[PDB]
Amino acid sequence: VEYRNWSKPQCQITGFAPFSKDNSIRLSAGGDIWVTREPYVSCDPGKCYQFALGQGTTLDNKHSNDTVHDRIPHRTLLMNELGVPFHLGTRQVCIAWSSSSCHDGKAWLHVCITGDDKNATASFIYDGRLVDSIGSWSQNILRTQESECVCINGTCTVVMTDGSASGRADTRILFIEEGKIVHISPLSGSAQHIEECSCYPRYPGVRCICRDNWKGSNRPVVDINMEDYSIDSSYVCSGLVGDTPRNDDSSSNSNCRNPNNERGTQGVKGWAFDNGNDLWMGRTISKESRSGYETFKVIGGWSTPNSKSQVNRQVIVDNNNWSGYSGIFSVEGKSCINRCFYVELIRGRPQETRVWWTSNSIVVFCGTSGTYGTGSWPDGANINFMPI
Amino acid sequence: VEYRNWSKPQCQITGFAPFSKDNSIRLSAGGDIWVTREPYVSCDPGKCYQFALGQGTTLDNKHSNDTVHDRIPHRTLLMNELGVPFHLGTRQVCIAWSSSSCHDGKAWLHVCITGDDKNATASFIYDGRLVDSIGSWSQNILRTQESECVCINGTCTVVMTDGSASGRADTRILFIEEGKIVHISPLSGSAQHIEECSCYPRYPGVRCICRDNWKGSNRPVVDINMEDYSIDSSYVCSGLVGDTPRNDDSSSNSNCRNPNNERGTQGVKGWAFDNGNDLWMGRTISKESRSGYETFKVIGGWSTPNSKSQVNRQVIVDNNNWSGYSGIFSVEGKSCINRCFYVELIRGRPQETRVWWTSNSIVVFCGTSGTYGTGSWPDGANINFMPI
Amino acid sequence: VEYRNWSKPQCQITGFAPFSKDNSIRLSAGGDIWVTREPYVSCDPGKCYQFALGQGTTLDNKHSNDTVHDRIPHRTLLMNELGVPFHLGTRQVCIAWSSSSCHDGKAWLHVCITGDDKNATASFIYDGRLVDSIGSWSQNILRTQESECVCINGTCTVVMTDGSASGRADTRILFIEEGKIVHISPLSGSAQHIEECSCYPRYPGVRCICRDNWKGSNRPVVDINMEDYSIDSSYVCSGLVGDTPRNDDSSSNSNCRNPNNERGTQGVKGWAFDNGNDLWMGRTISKESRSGYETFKVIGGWSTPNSKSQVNRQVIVDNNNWSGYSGIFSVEGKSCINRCFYVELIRGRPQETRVWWTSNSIVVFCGTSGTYGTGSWPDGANINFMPI
Amino acid sequence: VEYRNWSKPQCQITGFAPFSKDNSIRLSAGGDIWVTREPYVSCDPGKCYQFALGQGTTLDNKHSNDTVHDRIPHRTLLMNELGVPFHLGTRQVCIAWSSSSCHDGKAWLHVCITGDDKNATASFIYDGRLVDSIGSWSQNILRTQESECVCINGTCTVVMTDGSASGRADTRILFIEEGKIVHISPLSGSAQHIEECSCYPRYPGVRCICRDNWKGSNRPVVDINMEDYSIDSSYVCSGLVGDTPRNDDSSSNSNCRNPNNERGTQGVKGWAFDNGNDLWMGRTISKESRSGYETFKVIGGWSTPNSKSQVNRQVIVDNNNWSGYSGIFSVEGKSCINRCFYVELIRGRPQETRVWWTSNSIVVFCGTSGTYGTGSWPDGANINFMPI
Ligand SMILES: *[C@@H]1O[C@H](CO)[C@@H](O[C@@H]2O[C@H](CO)[C@@H](O[C@@H]3O[C@H](CO)[C@@H](O)[C@H](O[C@H]4O[C@H](CO)[C@@H](O)[C@H](O)[C@@H]4O)[C@@H]3O)[C@H](O)[C@H]2NC(C)=O)[C@H](O)[C@H]1NC(C)=O
Ligand SMILES: *[C@@H]1O[C@H](CO)[C@@H](O[C@@H]2O[C@H](CO)[C@@H](O[C@@H]3O[C@H](CO)[C@@H](O)[C@H](O[C@H]4O[C@H](CO)[C@@H](O)[C@H](O)[C@@H]4O)[C@@H]3O)[C@H](O)[C@H]2NC(C)=O)[C@H](O)[C@H]1NC(C)=O
Ligand SMILES: *[C@@H]1O[C@H](CO)[C@@H](O[C@@H]2O[C@H](CO)[C@@H](O[C@@H]3O[C@H](CO)[C@@H](O)[C@H](O[C@H]4O[C@H](CO)[C@@H](O)[C@H](O)[C@@H]4O)[C@@H]3O)[C@H](O)[C@H]2NC(C)=O)[C@H](O)[C@H]1NC(C)=O
Ligand SMILES: *[C@@H]1O[C@H](CO)[C@@H](O[C@@H]2O[C@H](CO)[C@@H](O[C@@H]3O[C@H](CO)[C@@H](O)[C@H](O[C@H]4O[C@H](CO)[C@@H](O)[C@H](O)[C@@H]4O)[C@@H]3O)[C@H](O)[C@H]2NC(C)=O)[C@H](O)[C@H]1NC(C)=O
Ligand SMILES: *[C@@H]1O[C@H](CO)[C@@H](O[C@@H]2O[C@H](CO)[C@@H](O)[C@H](O)[C@H]2NC(C)=O)[C@H](O)[C@H]1NC(C)=O
Ligand SMILES: *[C@@H]1O[C@H](CO)[C@@H](O[C@@H]2O[C@H](CO)[C@@H](O)[C@H](O)[C@H]2NC(C)=O)[C@H](O)[C@H]1NC(C)=O
Ligand SMILES: *[C@@H]1O[C@H](CO)[C@@H](O[C@@H]2O[C@H](CO)[C@@H](O)[C@H](O)[C@H]2NC(C)=O)[C@H](O)[C@H]1NC(C)=O
Ligand SMILES: CC(=O)N[C@H]1[C@H]([C@H](O)[C@H](O)CO)OC(C(=O)O)=C[C@@H]1NC(=N)N
Numbered sequence A, B, C, D: 001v002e003y004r005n006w007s008k009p010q011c012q013i014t015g016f017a018p019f020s021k022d023n024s025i026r027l028s029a030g031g032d033i034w035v036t037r038e039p040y041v042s043c044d045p046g047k048c049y050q051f052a053l054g055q056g057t058t059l060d061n062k063h064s065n066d067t068v069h070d071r072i073p074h075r076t077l078l079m080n081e082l083g084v085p086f087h088l089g090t091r092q093v094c095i096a097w098s099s100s101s102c103h104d105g106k107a108w109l110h111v112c113i114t115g116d117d118k119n120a121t122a123s124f125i126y127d128g129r130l131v132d133s134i135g136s137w138s139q140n141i142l143r144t145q146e147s148e149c150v151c152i153n154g155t156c157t158v159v160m161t162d163g164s165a166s167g168r169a170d171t172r173i174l175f176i177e178e179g180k181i182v183h184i185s186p187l188s189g190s191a192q193h194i195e196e197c198s199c200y201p202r203y204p205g206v207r208c209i210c211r212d213n214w215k216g217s218n219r220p221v222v223d224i225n226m227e228d229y230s231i232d233s234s235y236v237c238s239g240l241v242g243d244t245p246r247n248d249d250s251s252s253n254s255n256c257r258n259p260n261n262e263r264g265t266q267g268v269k270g271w272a273f274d275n276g277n278d279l280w281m282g283r284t285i286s287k288e289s290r291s292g293y294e295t296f297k298v299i300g301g302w303s304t305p306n307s308k309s310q311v312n313r314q315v316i317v318d319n320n321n322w323s324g325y326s327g328i329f330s331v332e333g334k335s336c337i338n339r340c341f342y343v344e345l346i347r348g349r350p351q352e353t354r355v356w357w358t359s360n361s362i363v364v365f366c367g368t369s370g371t372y373g374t375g376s377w378p379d380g381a382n383i384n385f386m387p388i
């Protein structure tokens, strides 16, 4: 078994095709299924796995009460083959209320963060053993991607933040070899706030589209040089911005360099990726709430400031249904690297108060060079049918 | 691991022997079990798997209500080892309300159709990654086999239809290499309506017996040339016809060439295969309803128009019990290729209205050159014992 | 991987030590667990599996009602790693209300009998595919061992009976190569009724201790020559007899040759094996009912007619608790072949009428050359705590 | 695959980082989960497993009533991958109310004790088969480590005791090769009572920190010479003692040689390990009850009698929460052997009488050379939410 290098060109795509769906919430009404949030997907060279942060409880369980909260000691990282719902046989890979995972071609790396808000611990687990750990550097909720990290030639990279959720924070990029932290680079560039990066291999480096929770509804970009550990950052040029909340399409802006100061505070994890001058991106359909989900290509979305010409739109989840987090993952094909994405379908609180829990299912799409039609693939549970 | 060629003679058989049964519905009354329909079986070179289209819910679950419907966004393709019932640990292989799967000797191919009736998407997943996709070509419920596809020397073929369920439609035959569509041939020959083909290797080609939902209660045949992609089609010669509904045996006809125009509209997925001039086939015992299941050999059933001399009949499910879809699968033996079949045993609506759900179990038989007795292997659930 | 030959001497044992227990019935009161009976154990060269005949239902399930009956179409052979209780993820290996299984060193053979009492079918499944089948030869409940078959040098043998349960029947010994029946030998010798043989490798042949359901409370012996297919039979010499019912120790007899005509009608599956002139055997503690279970060595029990000197007794299940079937299995060690046994612990009807079902758990012991103490390892469920 | 030698230096650590947590009890309130106690962790060269002694029942089950008791015939050793909670698919590895397991690089050894208090049997199972057994030598509850044994170059060692729980007993050290007992050494040295040793490889030998249930609240040490089978023993030098009950830190003592006679009777399984003159250890936070859990390094804790200078303290479980047993396990890294530990989190009786059962979950930490923060990772179940 050899290290992944991801040294193939990016697959040229025409859009995305249905890949997976787990129906977690529908099943929870007739079976013992984990309460989760912050899911993601990552694949070893052979097969794909679905991940999520458990809440230390199943849904039909009095412990499901008040699971809207983000951080408790009982949250653990769950890992199943993609499409296997989180049943009671699911392995809890580590303790985590924030995480990132990736396979370097030989073994799995898991980055798991847990403990006190003001003094958290990140554990680094590789090939099934704890290899390293680091403590909070800013004493304010050390946190990471909530989607896959990326490895090239045996070095995995992950983006981590510690500090204010509504102001300048301390973001660092780690380089990890077989679970051992070998280098840490400070964030550099023009991005002013970085959270929950959705990263992907772009040989010879790694590129990330993240969440600015402070002043931007445009998404920050973090570029990682795997050769000399140097870091650059900016913002996605597209005038059709990807965060939520955000202004409507007719009044949104991005200059590629600065946070737009348009409903900048708060946000949601998301993704986008470049193709030459163009940009493929997803976002919630609603501009103010985590409702609906759409993807499209923005012409000049990567290179041209404030570009707003889109094409190849697809509805993933219609705007009558709840969405949530979304993130990218990459899958190596015979001759090219394909881009896929998942979306978290959040049910329960705070939006749906009939129940006292908060959980999610997922739906997953992959880049295609073929053709496709239309549809909508929401969570599908009837809130009135659920144990409260 | 080498590609399958299926280049062995067909096993000579005297009938069929019991192979598998999952007791899905009986178990659903005391356990969390998926609601399904449209099951099938396919085997890799080592072992067999049972497949089915889930309804995104378990049976003892309020979401089981009104699962009689064929197409919702939450249907996914399930896959377990044969004889492992669809419990909550079952892997959902892809999103699909119509599907076909097959192993080429190296990896699994999955053809998964989902989305809007008028604009569906078929995803092609090979070796655990999405490789290709195609959109609806006639904007009227793109649909496929609901049983195993067939691969020879690295090329897998599958039959798909788009268009009217009760009139001329657009049927195409796809040739797929490692998940990539390399050629598409239009249907040719005298078959006038093609649905839900049950295909099997007949080296050097592939042969399919299908469902004519328009004018024929005789089953159409599709012959696929894997070498030059040419297509031929006709109808099973046997005067004992295999569709449901159909005329009684004394007034049924087939001329090998045209739909018989006898209770031709509607139908059910089924199978048959040739042995020289003779035909082995199954069908429901009832001529108008999906009740009972019987197999027999028709002497001259392949070569002689309107032949009605049968022998070696076996009851699989007696006519007091519900059946449903049936399909063929092929298993490679030491010196010959054996033919097997499964029978879908539908319970619930529309026939059984005490409950509000629709689901199924399966029973499976394989060709034998030995001897055997008699029996009946129905679903076995007591509708009165079921959660409604 | 090479065929098993079992060409090592039998391990010299001092008695038996605890090996496994599944607690099936206790768990059934708080979890979804298969209803079973007629369990056994068999191991591949690496590890051991527990088998049983399911009743097509879990215990906490209205379908568990009236499962005291021996034969329905929904019974299937279940197979898990030893110690894994029959949960809903259990694989149903074949359709069977009577069975036998064994591994020849390369793959698993399953002999599965189902269908009508008067016209049953035995299916032979090898390496995951149906290879052969035979129909009933006496039209009266074709039946087999309910414990492991035995393979030497690629040839597996199994004992089958068809005909009266209370009079002369038609017993045959099959020889099977990779699932294919290659020879069938009639029973020969002085055994007058043969059922449910517990067989073991005794290189170069196979030896079986069985159940005479007609005239003997002494257990029949069947000796199988794997070289020329010849068959011999007799009765265990020991004056301490192994069947239930039987006379008490002071009035029981065996002459090694004929059924003793002592409470000979009815019986229970059991086991014993020879060591030189001596015999190791198990039996129920009660002489009339399937209660308790004990093992001991009879001095001269193999060679001396009516020998009644025992030593090294061990209580496996005390006489205040229900037992049932028991059988032998053999495990290859570094330098010798060890003998182990399981016992079926039957709960429910007909003995316990508070519940309407019949099921079992198991306890398993293996031969030891070391030392050991005392105990009792019954089912352990409180009948009053059970779903009825 | 080669035998383990553990011939690498001990990893230098700065403390411990979060590794695993199973949330057993929270899950038991909404799912079918085994009732357990006496858990531990052990890893093969690739991955880690969690073990525990089942009570032959799930928690939401009437059989969970009165499971506070230590020894019943239905207790079996459970084994899952670490982080997989004990669901119904869990393998019961052997019958046991006391156990120890370890992997020698090639296969698993299991030491399983069950049967009558006065006449127990220890079974030795290696590579999936029973290889040896030994009977009770003092007729008073033969018992062992309840944590991993240790193997070097194909020889595994385990510590066992038989005799008084509150007086002089008979402790022996077994050396086992491929499941076969090759030598037994009597305890020697100054330790006066030995139970439940937590052992670890310290090449070329093995070192154990145990429980003195008679006169010491200081923990006994047992040193095992794997080359000549010689045994030495003493007591942990640290004046900060590790047993419960114990004197408070101001009035506790140890002289490295003798039991301290400070609240010496009773106790709890625990651990510690040396690093030069220093000691890393864990213990309950409460000095009289199994509540809370803390780790720290004692400067001179290994070499200096009565040393009480600690540093690098970490709270694992705060003193408002129940703990229980704890034990060490060792994990081979690229260049060093790391030390890890688990903590048993006991819920139910006798401390919490709303419920009638006794069970536990686990939390697991591994040594780190990196940095870390603070937290508390208790069981987390709400006793009021539990089935009683
Ligand atoms: C069957 O399915 C196919 C494939 O999904 C589908 O074709 C697609 O239609 C959409 C919508 O027309 C196309 O995407 C659009 O492209 C135009 C540029 O040509 C953009 O201007 C559009 O964006 C505007 O309109 C959107 C609403 O449609 C707004 O949300 C957005 O803010 C803009 O105002 C949009 O991106 C897409 O390019 C094609 N795909 C392909 C490959 O042709 C087809 O319509 C379906 N057929 C039917 C009748 O259902
Ligand atoms: C024990 O089991 C064996 C094996 O199943 C069984 O033998 C089989 O009997 C059936 C029924 O007689 C045979 O099948 C028939 O073959 C004749 C030609 O010889 C056909 O004419 C029959 O078809 C007509 O009758 C059917 C009803 O039986 C109608 O449904 C049909 O429309 C036709 O009118 C039928 O195909 C079969 O050939 C044998 N199998 C073998 C290998 O011998 C035997 O009867 C069983 N014994 C008992 C008493 O259960
Ligand atoms: C601790 O455990 C050991 C191992 O189990 C145990 O030693 C065993 O005791 C039994 C009972 O005494 C021995 O078996 C007996 O052997 C004598 C011949 O020496 C037979 O006569 C006995 O059979 C008669 O008695 C039985 C009841 O005990 C009747 O059921 C039977 O019908 C006969 O009347 C019986 O087989 C056995 O040999 C030893 N095992 C060894 C290896 O020594 C020991 O007793 C236990 N200690 C205590 C005090 O519990
Ligand atoms: C963020 O996390 C870090 C890492 O956990 C943490 O630093 C640690 O603080 C503890 C507590 O001060 C240190 O442990 C102490 O070490 C001193 C010697 O230097 C000992 O005297 C202490 O023992 C006494 O006090 C204990 C209570 O704190 C008593 O229980 C005990 O009986 C003694 O009286 C204790 O061992 C530890 O060394 C550091 N760790 C490192 C690596 O620096 C830090 O405090 C956290 N920050 C916050 C604000 O949460
Ligand atoms: C399954 O769903 C159906 C449809 O909603 C339910 O039946 C309906 O119940 C409503 C409310 O009482 C009635 O007003 C309608 O007349 C019913 N519809 C039909 C078509 O009969 C039914 O209750 C559900 N089944 C279960 C078991 O909950
Ligand atoms: C198991 O099945 C039997 C047979 O139906 C049930 O016993 C019968 O119950 C009916 C209706 O409740 C009574 O009228 C009959 O008197 C019973 N028949 C017999 C033979 O006693 C029994 O109730 C079922 N058990 C459970 C728990 O459902
Ligand atoms: C657990 O078992 C105990 C003991 O049987 C039960 O408590 C007893 O109940 C009986 C009958 O009601 C009383 O007479 C005794 O006084 C009780 N014993 C004790 C020690 O209190 C208890 O009910 C069981 N728990 C549950 C939830 O079923
Ligand atoms: C570590 C932590 O709690 N991270 C958060 C996160 C966070 O609050 C913001 O991004 C602000 O910094 O946002 C939210 C959110 O849904 O917006 C979920 C996360 N939940 C978990 N990761 N557990």
Ligand SMILES: CC(=O)N[C@H]1[C@H]([C@H](O)[C@H](O)CO)OC(C(=O)O)=C[C@@H]1NC(=N)N
Pocket (backbone or CB within 6 Å): B038, B053, B070, B071, B097, B098, B099, B141, B142, B143, B146, B164, B165, B195, B213, B267, B268
């Ligand atoms: C795609 C789809 O909905 N196909 C159908 C199918 C169909 O309606 C006819 O064949 C007419 O074209 O028939 C039936 C049927 O039970 O008759 C089940 C199917 N259900 C599913 N495949 N889900």
Ligand SMILES: CC(=O)N[C@H]1[C@H]([C@H](O)[C@H](O)CO)OC(C(=O)O)=C[C@@H]1NC(=N)N
Pocket (backbone or CB within 6 Å): C038, C053, C070, C071, C097, C098, C141, C142, C143, C146, C164, C165, C195, C196, C213, C267, C268
């Ligand atoms: C095939 C069949 O029904 N065999 C029987 C069996 C049998 O009735 C006698 O041995 C008489 O011939 O006995 C019993 C019994 O417990 O005695 C269980 C079996 N149950 C099952 N094997 N399913």
Ligand SMILES: CC(=O)N[C@H]1[C@H]([C@H](O)[C@H](O)CO)OC(C(=O)O)=C[C@@H]1NC(=N)N
Pocket (backbone or CB within 6 Å): D038, D053, D070, D071, D097, D098, D099, D141, D142, D143, D146, D164, D165, D195, D213, D267, D268
């Ligand atoms: C074999 C046995 O029953 N051992 C004990 C044990 C024991 O009583 C003492 O150490 C004194 O000898 O302590 C306790 C304990 O929680 O204190 C748990 C054990 N339970 C089990 N191992 N099952």
Ligand SMILES: *[C@@H]1O[C@H](CO)[C@@H](O)[C@H](O)[C@H]1NC(C)=O
Pocket (backbone or CB within 6 Å): A065, A066, A356, A388
């Ligand atoms: C959840 O907890 C809240 C706050 O304690 C309580 O008011 C509510 O009743 C709980 N919900 C359920 C379903 O028990």
Ligand SMILES: [Ca+2]
Pocket (backbone or CB within 6 Å): A211, A212, A213, A214, A215, A216, A217, A243, A244, A245, A263, A264, A265, A266, A267, A268
């Ligand atoms: Ca924002």
Ligand SMILES: [Ca+2]
Pocket (backbone or CB within 6 Å): B211, B212, B213, B214, B215, B216, B217, B243, B244, B245, B263, B264, B265, B266, B267, B268
């Ligand atoms: Ca038709």
Ligand SMILES: [Ca+2]
Pocket (backbone or CB within 6 Å): C211, C212, C213, C214, C215, C216, C217, C243, C244, C245, C263, C264, C265, C266, C267, C268
């Ligand atoms: Ca008898």
Ligand SMILES: [Ca+2]
Pocket (backbone or CB within 6 Å): D211, D212, D213, D214, D215, D216, D217, D243, D244, D245, D263, D264, D265, D266, D267, D268
């Ligand atoms: Ca003590």
